[PDB]
Amino acid sequence: MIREERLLKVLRAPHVSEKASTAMEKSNTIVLKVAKDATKAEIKAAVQKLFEVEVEVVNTLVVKGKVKRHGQRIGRRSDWKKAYVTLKEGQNL
Amino acid sequence: AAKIRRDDEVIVLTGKDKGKRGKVKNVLSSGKVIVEGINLVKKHQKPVPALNQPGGIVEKEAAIQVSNVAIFNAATGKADRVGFRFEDGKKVRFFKSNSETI
Amino acid sequence: MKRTFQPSVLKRNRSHGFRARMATKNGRQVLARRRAKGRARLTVSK
Amino acid sequence: MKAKELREKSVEELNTELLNLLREQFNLRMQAASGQLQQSHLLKQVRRDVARVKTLLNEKAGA
Amino acid sequence: SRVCQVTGKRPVTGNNRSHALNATKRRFLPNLHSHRFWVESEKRFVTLRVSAKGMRVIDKKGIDTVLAELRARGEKY
Amino acid sequence: HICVTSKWFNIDNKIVDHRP
RNA sequence: AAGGUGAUAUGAACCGUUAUAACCGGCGAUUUCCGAAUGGGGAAACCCAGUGUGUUUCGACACACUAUCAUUAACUGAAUCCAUAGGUUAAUGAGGCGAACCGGGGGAACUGAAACAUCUAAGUACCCCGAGGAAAAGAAAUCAACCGAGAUUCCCCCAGUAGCGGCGAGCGAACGGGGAGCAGCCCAGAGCCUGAAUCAGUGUGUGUGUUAGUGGAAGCGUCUGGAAAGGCGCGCGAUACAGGGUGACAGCCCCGUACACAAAAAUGCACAUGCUGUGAGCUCGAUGAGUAGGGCGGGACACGUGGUAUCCUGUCUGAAUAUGGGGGGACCAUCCUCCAAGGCUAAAUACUCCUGACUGACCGAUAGUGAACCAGUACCGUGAGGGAAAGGCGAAAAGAACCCCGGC
RNA sequence: UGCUGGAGGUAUCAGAAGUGCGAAUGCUGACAUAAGUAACGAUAAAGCGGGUGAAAAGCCCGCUCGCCGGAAGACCAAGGGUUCCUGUCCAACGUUAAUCGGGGCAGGGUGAGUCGACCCCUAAGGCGAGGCCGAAAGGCGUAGUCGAUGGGAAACAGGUUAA
RNA sequence: CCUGCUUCCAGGAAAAGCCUCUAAGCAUCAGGUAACAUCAAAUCGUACCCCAAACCGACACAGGUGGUCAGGUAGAGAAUA
Numbered sequence A: 001m002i003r004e005e006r007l008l009k010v011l012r013a014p015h016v017s018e019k020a021s022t023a024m025e026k027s028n029t030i031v032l033k034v035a036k037d038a039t040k041a042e043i044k045a046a047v048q049k050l051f052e053v054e055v056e057v058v059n060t061l062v063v064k065g066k067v068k069r070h071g072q073r074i075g076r077r078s079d080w081k082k083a084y085v086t087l088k089e090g091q092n093l
Numbered sequence B: 001a002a003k004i005r006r007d008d009e010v011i012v013l014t015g016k017d018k019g020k021r022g023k024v025k026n027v028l029s030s031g032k033v034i035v036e037g038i039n040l041v042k043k044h045q046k047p048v049p050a051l052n053q054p055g056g057i058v059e060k061e062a063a064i065q066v067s068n069v070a071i072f073n074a075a076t077g078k079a080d081r082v083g084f085r086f087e088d089g090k091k092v093r094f095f096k097s098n099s100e101t102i
Numbered sequence C: 001m002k003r004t005f006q007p008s009v010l011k012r013n014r015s016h017g018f019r020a021r022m023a024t025k026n027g028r029q030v031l032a033r034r035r036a037k038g039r040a041r042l043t044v045s046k
Numbered sequence D: 001m002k003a004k005e006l007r008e009k010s011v012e013e014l015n016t017e018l019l020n021l022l023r024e025q026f027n028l029r030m031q032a033a034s035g036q037l038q039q040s041h042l043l044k045q046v047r048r049d050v051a052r053v054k055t056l057l058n059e060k061a062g063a
Numbered sequence E: 001s002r003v004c005q006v007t008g009k010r011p012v013t014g015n016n017r018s019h020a021l022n023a024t025k026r027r028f029l030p031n032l033h034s035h036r037f038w039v040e041s042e043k044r045f046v047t048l049r050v051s052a053k054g055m056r057v058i059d060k061k062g063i064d065t066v067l068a069e070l071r072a073r074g075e076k077y
Numbered sequence F: 001h002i003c004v005t006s007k008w009f010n011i012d013n014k015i016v017d018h019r020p
Numbered sequence G: 001a002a003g004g005u006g007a008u009a010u011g012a013a014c015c016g017u018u019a020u021a022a023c024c025g026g027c028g029a030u031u032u033c034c035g036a037a038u039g040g041g042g043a044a045a046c047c048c049a050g051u052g053u054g055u056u057u058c059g060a061c062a063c064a065c066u067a068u069c070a071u072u073a074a075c076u077g078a079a080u081c082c083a084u085a086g087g088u089u090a091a092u093g094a095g096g097c098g099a100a101c102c103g104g105g106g107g108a109a110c111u112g113a114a115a116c117a118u119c120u121a122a123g124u125a126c127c128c129c130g131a132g133g134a135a136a137a138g139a140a141a142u143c144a145a146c147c148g149a150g151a152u153u154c155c156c157c158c159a160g161u162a163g164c165g166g167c168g169a170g171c172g173a174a175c176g177g178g179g180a181g182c183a184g185c186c187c188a189g190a191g192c193c194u195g196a197a198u199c200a201g202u203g204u205g206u207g208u209g210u211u212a213g214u215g216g217a218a219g220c221g222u223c224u225g226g227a228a229a230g231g232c233g234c235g236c237g238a239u240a241c242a243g244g245g246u247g248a249c250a251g252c253c254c255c256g257u258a259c260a261c262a263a264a265a266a267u268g269c270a271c272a273u274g275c276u277g278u279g280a281g282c283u284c285g286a287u288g289a290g291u292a293g294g295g296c297g298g299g300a301c302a303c304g305u306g307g308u309a310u311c312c313u314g315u316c317u318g319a320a321u322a323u324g325g326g327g328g329g330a331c332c333a334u335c336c337u338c339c340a341a342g343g344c345u346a347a348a349u350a351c352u353c354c355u356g357a358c359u360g361a362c363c364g365a366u367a368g369u370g371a372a373c374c375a376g377u378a379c380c381g382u383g384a385g386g387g388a389a390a391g392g393c394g395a396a397a398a399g400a401a402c403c404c405c406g407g408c
Numbered sequence H: 001u002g003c004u005g006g007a008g009g010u011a012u013c014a015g016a017a018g019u020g021c022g023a024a025u026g027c028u029g030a031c032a033u034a035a036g037u038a039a040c041g042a043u044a045a046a047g048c049g050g051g052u053g054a055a056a057a058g059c060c061c062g063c064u065c066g067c068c069g070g071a072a073g074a075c076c077a078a079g080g081g082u083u084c085c086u087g088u089c090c091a092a093c094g095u096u097a098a099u100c101g102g103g104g105c106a107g108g109g110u111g112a113g114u115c116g117a118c119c120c121c122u123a124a125g126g127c128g129a130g131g132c133c134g135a136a137a138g139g140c141g142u143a144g145u146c147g148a149u150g151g152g153a154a155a156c157a158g159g160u161u162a163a
Numbered sequence I: 001c002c003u004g005c006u007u008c009c010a011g012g013a014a015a016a017g018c019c020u021c022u023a024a025g026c027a028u029c030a031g032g033u034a035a036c037a038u039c040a041a042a043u044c045g046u047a048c049c050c051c052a053a054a055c056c057g058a059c060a061c062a063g064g065u066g067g068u069c070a071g072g073u074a075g076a077g078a079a080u081a
């Protein structure tokens, strides 16, 4: 095809979180933590194949890890990517 | 190679429960062991708000040194110490003082 | 009044960064000493 | 689960290969993350299974 | 570098000494020159950076020998 | 505490020349 | 092997019990990105390519390869026809890091002289280059003194002597003797005989060490106590009374210890051979020239130019060649003794980033490593760089259910 | 020897030294003193009512009052790096209290063919195959290759999120 | 508008994108121009402070910090009230 079926392990988790997620459900589109190296087109494919839905276009943004806690030293979390996916019309999941 | 093991009957050797006997409920990474009914303590367990919330005093088993329990003979009714080897196919444990094997 | 540290990352990296450090026999000895000292930040970079 | 497929055919294996991912692994992540998956240890194996899968096939072909 | 391609002569450090014997570091460096040499055995000129003596050797041993050396040793030339 | 930075000047400064 | 899924760290969900749980060792596999970084770039962990591959959804993305230098070959190929330089490809090797010991290129000043130039500190500190398991040195153009010795290296003497020295401060040998370890060989070449000694690289074998392991003796009674290993009594093992642990001090509770054993695999070391590369052997030859020496300038020799031998050479010179030449501390004779101007060479010697085991009239938390602790950390500094504090509940968490004041 | 303490200590005669502290404007830590004294960081200024609360001069809401308005309003770059928003808590941080916060804990939040970087292009300048030079380290520089503070295609009015 | 216009001396970046020109080269081809249709535009930044309590000043420090916008009354005014 263009992207091997193997590499459609880019979808990592739904981000069903906040009205941001759900209130932007009730007006098209779904959002997801997705890989890190994922290429919009590369992640559209995943959502076509798996999930078997339609997809108009996909937007991406990177979330930066909050650094916190600790006394002297310090701990930081990992960065990760957001989805915001926007399905064509016969919208299901 | 452990001279004492999981299901296994022993007589306490030192302290508190000097003379008592019991089965090894389970043995620990530390080389300490829990012998059922044997070395008891009274944990004041705290309540936890989200379910299993009541909490209360609880009598419970407290790990103790394997150095301080001996395997029990039954044939003689005393502590016996262990030893190794047949040359059978396996190894197995025999009571010292009568190669009695078990 | 204007004080001595006027931060600027471009200058920072260009003057003290890994590659700059790497571009000179002595700059390299700089790292070598810091490695031998077991330093956690060889050169304060991104 | 090792020699069980030491002899399982280079082409054939790439099947379970996908079947570990194609099914178990992807479904498991999704299902898990979504708060379903009550038996977490399934994530440990599958991943470890794919490792086996790829250990052969790599050692069968070419190496 | 100021190295004689024939003898390997290079600058060497020694001292100055005044009439009061004050030592001041200094260098003796060789009498280099660079010289177009005809080989004939290659129908060509070759410029070697050469010391006098380097020349006097070439005079005696004769060019081609000297050129066996250098090439034997790897000198560019 | 964290509490540990002392950059004590130079004397302090003003005046004095105390006739020579 | 009967228990396991590293630690803070419970919990969840699991896995295993007579052999595919875990754990230990041998050999494999995978091994993102940056970093010598090597496809180009770059503000390290990022941007962008050329060419090859890759798609019953053969686009764009993914992967592989493409740095430079050296050697060798091949093909190409100017001014210039020949020929070179230049250019493409290819095969090999290099590159970077690393504690000391080692050889080499450079090389201070404080300081000492009760000041300071000579002299000292000192060929030290430091910079640099290079290499090995050791390095270097080494098979007399050496000493001796008319008797003799017989490579190099290290140790003790000789001796703080002889000497050097603003004869100040200081520096400081050798001869000869006692020891450690000892080893000797090639090239400067052609003929015959030819791959014959040997060395390295390598495959195999064997033995021996290594990287997991196995077995391993014998204690009970009672007293005090929260707890016995302690006291007292009576037994027992000892080729095992090294040591650690266990509720207080244990040969006989545990782990060991002495002792006896063990390797599927990979390896260090020896031999034994196979393969590659290499030369052995006899006859007859050959015997290290811009060198020795000298002049000038420095430097090395304990030796500061001194009556100064000897060694090295920046500079200008320049022999003899066995009936010859070097040295014997100016120099000459005689005598004696050695053979420079090509190389190789093991041991006695040096060192410890690191592995294992063992030891101490060494420290015990302001000590000892800066660091007994998640320390080169927190912190300070643009940076180089500097650089802390901080160990102990109990035998066992049995780490205080529940009630009361208080602002859940 | 009493008390405390709760596990080590060692006569004797020999032996060996990190062997004795009040001073060094010594070193480290702890604790005094002045003293409940100065001070609480612009003289733009507050008053009251009602909420909440264990507690309100300081928070919330309201009505007045006052202050900036070429700023003391508004958008950024540089620099910071979660300080943004929402719940929750008030020990420590806040020069007072604190129900409040840029403070603790948890959760959320950054959506681009068109803005910007990457990218093409170069200035200063940097690096620099070969190369010239240099005891070593290295120096300079050609071909190039990098480097914006400058050049280079393209979206506007309105709405909506607690953010 | 204006990178204009007038004037003066101190005489006022570079390169690419863009336009055009052809060489080797291709000549039915390929390319070039236009209309319509369609497909592609990845990646990274985007919160918040920014004359300040969030940056440089050890501090919630009377200091320092470049660019942008600029209403009414009086006023020459970005002064001042």
Ligand SMILES: N[C@@H](Cc1c[nH]c2ccccc12)C(=O)O
Binding pocket: F010, F011, F012, F013, F014, F015, F016
């Ligand atoms: N007043 C100062 C003396 C002084 C005078 N000039 C100075 C300059 C710098 C520092 C101190 C001083 C003191 O207390 O000692």
Ligand SMILES: N[C@@H](Cc1c[nH]c2ccccc12)C(=O)O
Binding pocket: F014, F015, F016, F017, F018
């Ligand atoms: N000596 C003068 C002036 C003075 C003040 N401070 C000083 C510091 C250095 C020298 C001089 C001064 C005085 O005390 O009145």
Ligand SMILES: [Mg+2]
Binding pocket: A060, A061, A062
């Ligand atoms: Mg984005």
Ligand SMILES: [Mg+2]
Binding pocket: none
């Ligand atoms: Mg690269």
Ligand SMILES: [Mg+2]
Binding pocket: none
């Ligand atoms: Mg590169």
Ligand SMILES: [Mg+2]
Binding pocket: G113
């Ligand atoms: Mg002096």
Ligand SMILES: [Mg+2]
Binding pocket: none
């Ligand atoms: Mg004789």
Ligand SMILES: [Mg+2]
Binding pocket: none
């Ligand atoms: Mg054993």
Ligand SMILES: [Mg+2]
Binding pocket: none
């Ligand atoms: Mg035993």
Ligand SMILES: [Mg+2]
Binding pocket: G287
């Ligand atoms: Mg000779």
Ligand SMILES: [Mg+2]
Binding pocket: none
């Ligand atoms: Mg040698």
Ligand SMILES: [Mg+2]
Binding pocket: none
């Ligand atoms: Mg310490």
Ligand SMILES: [Mg+2]
Binding pocket: none
């Ligand atoms: Mg103490």
Ligand SMILES: [Mg+2]
Binding pocket: none
């Ligand atoms: Mg004292």
Ligand SMILES: [Mg+2]
Binding pocket: H023
């Ligand atoms: Mg005193």
Ligand SMILES: [Mg+2]
Binding pocket: H037
């Ligand atoms: Mg007072």
